[PDB]
């Protein structure tokens with residue numbers, strides 16, 4: 119049952135004993151493997167048609183409480199048993215319970231640490247947790263969000279942070295940030311079916327306009343936020359421009375690159391994922407750290423279904439776009455990623471290239487093998503979108519599983 | 533909706549369901565609990581040398597299934613010819629404990645095995661395979677002749693043609709026909725006194741085996757190894773391939789004139805020879821196959837892997853890049869030029885080769901063909917997506933379902 123994991127570059131071997139702590143199932147079965155699939159239906163965090171079985175919740179709760187007390191080394195102590203009784207007393211009476219701030223802080227860090235698709239987990243211990251559970255309106259959500267952005271951005275010296283809004287309650291709507299990220303560019307479906315801006319945001323762009331936003335017409339227009347308090351229609355809030363740090367893209371040696379007018383925001387703040395700690399679900403808990411250059415240079419700017427600039431750059435580079443064998447695509451992509459690194463560095467905005475990132479992830483895997491006996495990792499997401507085998511992670515076998523606390527996907531609120 | 537895996541292509545937004553996996557009678561490494569999909573060698577298809585034949589009944593169910601697949605392919609499922617072959621196979625297994633395939637069944641199964649190979653990106657060519665029947669081979673000496681004939685036909689002076697040579701299957705109470713080498717053409721890996729390796733580090737063990745068996749080793753970086761061929765119940769015999777049969781390509785760069793001075797080269801024919809071909813329960817322990825290279829196999833993995841030739845730093849230094857910092861993307865720049873050199877050199881030498889863009893585009897077409905034909909296609913994402921420029925190819929944005937279908941190409945223990 120315990121997987122023999124091998125590193126093909128070093129020839130070393132380790133055994134993942136941590137996967138035995140996985141209580142939640144993945145999409146894979148012995149008959150077939152579905153690991154390369156992005157979204158699920160089995161792993162998806164379904165709404166509250168009523169309260170989930172007190173036994174199920176009490177079981178996830180006690181385990182989390184056990185995890186917390188081990189973390190502070192006060193396991194078995196009086197404080198530990200009294201807390202377990204508190205949780206049980208609360209679930210038995212109300213069908214749910216609440217976390218203390220220190221437990222929420224520990225839970226958020228473990229969720230990040232347990233994230234299989236995150237290559238920046240060496241930073242898991244350093245996380246600023248903003249308790250926003252004292253929130254009752256969309257307007258209050260906006261203030262907490264603005265403060266998250268101000269803190270996280272820090273004039274370019276990015277700091278990892280997460281803001282946790284009120285947990286889900288049975289028989290009541292969720293607190294939700296409709297946007298997939300706190301900062302995203304609009305995608306305007308221009309008549310011909312084409313798109314001006316980010317194609318990945320066409321839907322959220324349409325909703326913002328549908329809710330009163332007067333749209334622009336640029337390729338890089340920062341979107342307003344649609345914040346939703348329980349059982350209320352989402353409200354529109356335009357983020358203050360001084361809060362949104364952006365980096366104009368230019369190349370270190372190619373003068374004309376800047377002419378392309380490309381740019382990207384500094385803060386990657388995913389805001390559509392659910393944070394589950396001890397059975398409790400936080401439907402609104404935006405998190406952020408800092409970008410790895412390939413996210414912008416390769417995926418956001420070069421994906422065919424995104425900005426898709428590979429050809430424009432190749433033409434400017436005077437490459438042979440007539441045939442695939444000239445590797446015009448590979449060359450253009452390398453310069454674009456280089457332009458991203460040069461630009462962010464020039465602007466004094468935190469960023470990490472894929473080589474540095476994967477090297478530190480390998481160190482993280484080692485730290486974790488000693489600390490927990492394994493590390494859940496999704497190979498397809500950990501290995502960068504360009505130069506895969508040129509990085510150490512490509513040659514490392516990985517085991518993917520779900521541990522809790524965890525960040526999970528959830529249905530779109532509309 | 534449907535009761536089958538939902539597969540999405542994120543670039544196009546399209547959806548398909550894999551119904552083919554429902555016919556997968558063999559389990560893989562994964563379980564609901566955890567995914568072991570990134571592991572290269574998961575003890576699943578692994579065929580640890582079974583002392584005696586498969587249980588007459590287990591071999592029978594496998595045999596009946598293959599015969600059923602065969603008749604379905606020729607559209608005579610349920611016919612008299614179909615029912616008679618099933619009886620003949622049972623009678624044969626009943627009196628001898630095993631059975632034999634007709635020529636057309638072997639050709640069908642060999643093609644199916646390739647079609648079923650999850651880690652092969654060149655499967656759009658699956659229907660075009662020359663199957664050399666070598667089931668009459670009785671000696672290592674004859675294995676060599678067949679192998680040389682395979683290399684001559686497959687190489688075809690640069691205009692490569694896919695082929696496979698099938699030697700006698702595993703027999704009850706008789707040793708196996710085995711080719712000790714991982715490939716028909718492989719470069720030697722010499723273990724230096726200072727711990728380093730001259731040549732290909734991947735081949736250190738087979739190189740040392742060739743020496744233990746009488747081979748007089750050279751001392752270059754690109755020395756073609758001799759073959760260690762083994763016939764039933766006999767020690768392996770050493771055979772040197774005639775240099776004129778082994779086509780090689782000297783590597784040069786289209787614009788960087790100094791690249792040629794590096795003295796780098798690669799052989800034209802990728803012929804895996806250590807894999808087991810399983811058809812209807814019958815095991816063909818010696819059945820080398822070959823097609824043509826996809827450029828990244830050479831330019832990225834073989835030449836740039838840290839545990840292979842590891843030439844990244846050397847080429848980067850020649851390009852005058854900053855190898856002291858990761859942010860210069862020196863590894864990326866060098867890798868691109870090395871792959872470009874491989875493509876340019878092969879095209880210059882009139883030798884078949886397919887770049888990673890062309891290969892993945894063609895595999896996307898293959899997936900579409902197979903969706904309509906069988907309702908799915910077993911694919912190992914980690915192996916299908918190229919080692920460089922991954923998301924720049926269409927397959928990166930295509931989810932895939934991986935499972936084991938038979939006939940199949942499986943891994944087998946080293947004969948030593």
Ligand code: HEM
Pocket residue numbers: 226230233235236237238239241245278279280388405406407408409410413470475499525
């Ligand atoms: C410290 C800097 C960080 C870096 C360099 C980093 C980098 C990455 C990268 C490259 C991905 C894949 C993104 C994609 O392909 O869309 C990712 C995913 C993820 N990261 Fe990190 N990360 C960092 C911080 C954080 C923090 C602070 C958290 C949580 C508290 C976090 C949670 C996750 C999660 C849950 C995912 C999965 C996203 C998804 O499923 O779409 N990351 N990270």
Ligand code: HEM
Pocket residue numbers: 642646649651652653654655657661694695696821822823824825826829886891915941
């Ligand atoms: C016609 C051109 C072909 C191309 C371009 C092609 C390309 C490839 C590539 C890129 C791989 C991955 C190799 C690696 O990462 O080590 C591969 C694997 C494979 N191919 Fe193909 N292939 C072709 C023909 C064939 C043929 C003719 C057969 C068999 C009859 C075949 C059977 C396989 C198998 C079983 C693997 C698995 C290798 C392993 O597990 O180590 N391929 N092929």
Ligand SMILES: N=C(NO)NCCC[C@H](N)C(=O)O
Pocket residue numbers: 238386387388406407408409410413414417418
């Ligand atoms: N680096 C982070 N979080 O720290 N990335 C989160 C996903 C961001 C997404 N890949 C983007 O390009 O916008």
Ligand SMILES: N=C(NO)NCCC[C@H](N)C(=O)O
Pocket residue numbers: 654715802803804822823824825826829830833834
């Ligand atoms: N293209 C093929 N077969 O047609 N490849 C088989 C594996 C070859 C291996 N990747 C090599 O570089 O030698």
Ligand SMILES: [Zn+2]
Pocket residue numbers: 146150151152153562566567568569
């Ligand atoms: Zn799996």
